[model samples]
Target: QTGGSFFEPFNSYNSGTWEKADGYSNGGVFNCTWRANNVNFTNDGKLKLGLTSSAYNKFDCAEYRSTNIYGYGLYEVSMKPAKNTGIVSSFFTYTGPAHGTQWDEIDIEFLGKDTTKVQFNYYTNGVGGHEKVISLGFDASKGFHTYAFDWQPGYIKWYVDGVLKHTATANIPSTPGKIMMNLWNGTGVDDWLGSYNGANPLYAEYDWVKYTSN
Candidate 1:
């Protein structure tokens, strides 16, 4: 087992050119420009990426990359959910290159204006291979709570504040992939990210990403 954390020295990226050692795409991911707005870090250490209402592709995001990383590790991020009524705040891991459709994903997506609950999704292939979508109960807007996923060779367990919310085993992705943290706004899908109606600006913020290998 092995583990590490990325916290300081938020660096610059060149997408396909000059790349950030820790920070993510400065070029684009899903037709969106990915850059670290390190100056946007809150007084409490939360790293803020895309804000709702900002002009970006439908899938606005920023992500970091680390390779050959396969383990039954604990992934944790502390965040305050966005206040928007029809948006979702997400933290998850991605498999490969921007256009690499052959990917696997694990997600914690908090939807709408309710910071008290969230949904989890596990995907092995591309579209329509959803494994599970479960709702959770939590107080996400008031204070920082940890969101985590416990992964093994054949299973995935999701938790908030150390309570198990989801567990799945079928259709597990069989490839070692990169870790990615992203913030996105999806439309035409009728999701939490698209259900908000208030003036709340969605943001997928993070305090830190820690991975402990099994």
Candidate 2:
């Protein structure tokens, strides 16, 4: 109920509409500090998030998020993930510890270890663990592709390139949250995302993001 619907082509670095995650580390799971400069706008009109070496093997990452919170809706994006190990390129919503609110989120994540499969999950309050990995039959890092989800009151449906791929019905989160996208390197979760292999100048690009109220 906090946000309605709109299309963001990321024509420029619009500070009034979005905020870049800055100066903090999520610690162990995500071993990098977020910096405002890590987010950029390409002349061709794309949102770019980076994962760059900050100092002596440490890293700096990028996260761009909306200033408004959106509700159940059809959330969509055209993006390309970074292909590498121990990294994640994501499009998700959150209103949690940082927001001084109960944790709730809807996730669309690309584990950098593989670009042919994608993952989806959600958390209600703070209880999560609902993760689904589906094959894409196409490389997500190769080019920009559409990914979306229709979040309704009773259920959620995920789509890949406009085709229905997965659905969920239990523990749906009701809290509205900011639309967000980020690219970062991970640590200590090698089993799930592989080892930390630094690919300098690594990035995740977003051609656009769209939302429609339900």
Candidate 3:
């Protein structure tokens, strides 16, 4: 097995190993602005990602990506999602555009509207159709939990605490991609996530991230 690790001590994100993603109204349905200041390491050594209100109808979010591309492997993360309504905490892999490239993606998202469940989905060459929502039967924001996805050449497996929850084979992404983590809010997606309120700051914390080749 070929595996790689990229760990950090609650320190400066400018160290040059992880790239802070930015753009105005980046990808999702929300009017979000990706900011470098929105992500930081806590004094206690955990990664803290924040989501806040920025400008009218605009929300500031955070995203960090691996500096290098990784092939098929087991992507694992120990994280806690935000609890505010309309927010989203995510961990996924993607390879396209920014690399000067359709969109190949694998995702694990925790929606704030329902902390008792997680949303799993994927896309290949920019066309996505598979989506599954798994019920955890417990509150996910109350504490940290390990969430992972094993992407092989022919299949992809989703796991929570080492327990398998879902799997997919058709249209699996085969191209190399970078692992990513983000915390953001949705706009037109309010029906699914409710509406986001910036009265108080919201955050998602990461204890660690790991990957192992299979």
By lDDT, the best candidate is 2
> In each prediction, how many residue pairs overlap at the backbone (N, C-alpha, C within less than 3 A)?
5, 0, 1
Residue-level lDDT tens digits of model 3 in 1-214: 2226545444555545578867665765865788888888888778899887756756788998877778887888989998878888999998887676557899999989898999999988888879899999779999889999999999999999999999998978887788889998887888878887764468999988887765
209 Cα displacement, candidate 2 (Å) = 0.4
**C-alpha TM-score for every candidate:** 0.70, 0.97, 0.90
Per-residue lDDT for 11 in model 3? Answer: 52
Model 3: residues with Cα > 4 Å off, grouped in runs: 1-14, 54-57
Cα error of candidate 1 at position 51, Å:
1.3
How accurate locally, in lDDT, is each candidate?
0.57, 0.92, 0.83
Looking at model 1, residue 50 earns an lDDT score of 62
Model 1, 1-214: lDDT tens per residue? 2234433322333253112222333432123334454225556556665643355333334544444344456777676666555555677766645535466777777764566677788777754345344445546766777788987778888888788878878776655555655554444445424542334244656666667765
Off by over 4 Å in 1: 1-35, 52-70, 97-101, 127-135, 195-202
Model 1, CA-based lDDT: 0.57
Q: Give the Cα error of residue 195 in candidate 3, in Å.
A: 2.6
lDDT of 2 at 33: 92
